[PDB]
XYZ file of C-alpha atoms in Angstrom:
136
model
C -1.392 -12.937 20.146
C -2.269 -11.481 16.609
C 1.356 -10.933 15.677
C 0.137 -11.252 12.103
C 0.812 -7.593 12.730
C 4.493 -8.303 12.401
C 3.897 -10.771 9.570
C 1.922 -8.054 7.829
C 4.635 -5.412 8.293
C 6.858 -7.983 6.592
C 4.428 -8.515 3.606
C 4.340 -4.762 3.054
C 8.131 -4.703 2.729
C 7.971 -7.498 0.182
C 5.096 -5.990 -1.778
C 7.177 -2.915 -1.950
C 10.267 -4.809 -3.182
C 8.703 -7.325 -5.552
C 5.539 -5.600 -6.762
C 5.904 -1.718 -6.606
C 9.746 -1.870 -7.064
C 9.770 -3.747 -10.348
C 6.820 -1.692 -11.748
C 8.466 1.575 -11.002
C 11.693 0.162 -12.561
C 10.048 -1.238 -15.703
C 8.572 2.106 -16.392
C 11.933 4.012 -15.694
C 13.498 1.960 -18.340
C 10.917 3.421 -20.754
C 11.407 6.915 -19.586
C 15.230 6.647 -19.983
C 14.917 5.110 -23.494
C 12.395 7.803 -24.234
C 14.968 10.454 -23.160
C 18.025 8.800 -24.610
C 16.340 8.552 -27.808
C 14.458 11.970 -27.647
C 18.061 13.183 -27.733
C 19.355 11.388 -30.736
C 16.258 13.094 -32.471
C 14.056 10.020 -32.731
C 7.550 8.569 -29.250
C 3.884 9.190 -29.975
C 0.773 7.452 -28.684
C 3.309 5.383 -26.678
C 3.755 8.337 -24.302
C -0.016 8.103 -23.515
C 0.244 4.359 -22.567
C 3.161 5.233 -20.447
C 1.831 8.473 -19.036
C -1.208 6.490 -17.726
C 0.908 3.713 -16.189
C 3.338 5.878 -14.257
C 0.344 7.650 -12.783
C -1.168 4.278 -11.591
C 2.130 3.151 -10.263
C 2.400 6.658 -8.595
C -0.954 6.260 -7.118
C 0.227 2.831 -5.948
C 3.203 4.394 -4.141
C 0.811 6.535 -2.328
C -1.785 3.810 -1.613
C 0.831 1.430 0.116
C 1.976 4.286 2.187
C -1.729 4.969 3.007
C -2.269 1.258 4.224
C 1.071 1.425 6.124
C -0.076 4.459 8.063
C -3.476 2.742 8.605
C -1.722 -0.095 10.198
C 0.431 1.963 12.517
C -2.843 3.639 13.375
C -4.245 0.138 14.036
C -1.194 -1.176 16.091
C -1.561 1.622 18.485
C -5.248 0.749 18.852
C -4.447 -2.961 19.555
C -1.700 -2.275 22.068
C -4.028 0.374 23.656
C -6.507 -2.497 24.162
C -3.918 -4.770 25.685
C -2.884 -2.256 28.319
C -6.526 -1.557 29.339
C -7.541 -5.207 28.942
C -4.475 -6.297 31.147
C -4.788 -3.750 34.088
C -8.564 -4.514 34.359
C -8.314 -8.193 35.625
C -5.615 -6.662 37.895
C -8.564 -6.302 40.270
C -16.365 -0.141 36.429
C -13.979 2.464 34.980
C -11.448 -0.069 33.979
C -14.468 -1.974 32.481
C -15.326 0.974 30.283
C -11.668 1.548 29.013
C -11.737 -1.949 27.634
C -15.084 -1.480 25.877
C -13.687 1.714 24.401
C -10.197 0.452 23.529
C -12.187 -2.313 21.864
C -14.317 0.043 19.806
C -11.328 2.026 18.789
C -9.666 -1.215 17.603
C -12.476 -2.863 15.497
C -12.601 0.552 13.895
C -8.974 0.698 13.198
C -9.164 -2.743 11.545
C -12.095 -1.605 9.403
C -10.004 1.308 8.196
C -7.094 -1.094 7.814
C -9.119 -3.568 5.822
C -10.343 -0.598 3.647
C -6.858 0.734 2.751
C -5.731 -2.708 1.846
C -8.747 -3.309 -0.533
C -7.759 0.118 -2.029
C -4.180 -1.046 -2.406
C -5.249 -4.342 -3.916
C -7.259 -2.023 -6.269
C -4.369 0.427 -7.189
C -1.780 -2.169 -7.832
C -4.135 -4.448 -9.889
C -4.436 -1.551 -12.319
C -0.826 -0.408 -12.242
C 0.083 -3.952 -13.240
C -2.359 -3.600 -16.109
C -1.589 -0.209 -17.525
C 2.014 -1.289 -17.391
C 1.292 -4.424 -19.398
C -0.697 -2.266 -21.893
C 2.632 -0.965 -22.998
C 2.544 -3.592 -25.780
C 2.576 -0.721 -28.062
C 4.073 -1.227 -31.473
């Protein structure tokens, strides 16, 4: 009963709402003040600081979506193994399915763990490039 899978699905939603959502917003404020002022005829090296951040934040949209696929990929692997695991002690071929559902699943987690580390990575920087907008 590793329904930490359901907990995780919930953390991903929160990460999306509290991390990614505020970041994307912060930067949207800047783009709209860039445009609202770029119309009154009034940005220089600032648009480099901002360019870089809305790319990290955009790489961070992508990355979360990449770990969210990876987990769907993994949830199929884990439920695959509980089907095979189950109908085996309903009694050599059944014994193999479990070994291979098992292999498919430790592999899915490996890919899942990877896509998380790479999401940890992307957001850590997006946080940073967006704080570096302490331009004067």
